[PDB]
Design a protein around this ligand. Structure first.
Ligand SMILES: Nc1ncnc2c1ncn2[C@@H]1O[C@H](COP(=O)(O)OP(=O)(O)O)[C@@H](O)[C@H]1O
Length: 201
């Protein structure tokens, strides 16, 4: 299936823009979403986490206490492999289920490290969500509760803005009025529908 890879630096708006494509009926594949899905309240993988590490892994609302799990892996690095062995097969399986169940003309794949992991060849098109550096910093501080200096260290561990823009086929700036960003998404959606038809012919 025709595939558009959505990338962008931390805090630029990958999740936000992907939701607007979803609203237009596009199947959105996002491994970070799938990872949360596989440990939702009541899931066997959440039970396995709690049975191993303790009931303190489950919040009063039945959800995974993510901080407590991060604390466990921080204290016991060997438990990272255990967690991977539990979750990786479930994430792969759910990724494939979502691909197979899709009936949309194209797929949107949210790929945070597309440039950093050299995956530019896998998708038919690359869409970069862009914002100024100061905007990434401000939005990451607010969402994630990190210092500005911490945000700068994350940016320094990611591809540069210039590198992402150089790899992009299309750029969406997640700035200005939200209505205009959504209209930009609708314009790109039409472009992708037409490219998907061209590829299918
Ligand atoms: N146009 C905007 N103006 C201000 N904040 C925004 C805007 N778009 C998204 N946000 C917020 O910015 C943060 C990062 O957006 P998100 O889509 O999660 O980025 P990413 O997935 O690229 O890390 C979130 O807290 C989100 O609510």
């Amino acid at each position: 299936t025709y595939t558009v890879a959505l990338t962008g630096g931390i805090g630029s708006g990958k999740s936000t823009v992907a939701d607007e494509f979803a609203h237009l009926g596009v199947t959105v594949i996002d491994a970070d979403i799938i990872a949360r899905q596989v440990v939702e309240p009541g899931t066997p993988a959440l039970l396995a986490i709690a049975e191993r590490f303790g009931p303190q892994m489950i919040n009063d609302d039945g959800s995974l206490n993510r901080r407590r799990l991060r604390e466990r892996i921080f204290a016991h690095s060997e438990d990272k492999a255990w967690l991977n062995a539990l979750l990786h097969p479930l994430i792969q399986q759910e990724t494939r289920r979502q691909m197979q169940a899709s009936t949309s003309p194209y797929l949107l794949w949210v790929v945070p490290l597309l440039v950093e992991n050299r995956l530019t060849d896998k998708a038919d098109r690359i869409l970069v969500v862009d914002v100024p550096k100061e905007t990434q910093i401000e939005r990451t501080i607010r969402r994630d509760g990190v210092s500005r200096e911490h945000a700068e260290h994350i940016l320094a561990a990611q591809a540069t803005r210039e590198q992402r823009l150089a790899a992009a086929d299309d750029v969406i700036e997640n700035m200005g009025s939200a209505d205009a960003v959504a209209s930009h998404v609708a314009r790109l959606h039409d472009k992708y529908l037409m490219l998907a038809s061209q590829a299918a012919s």
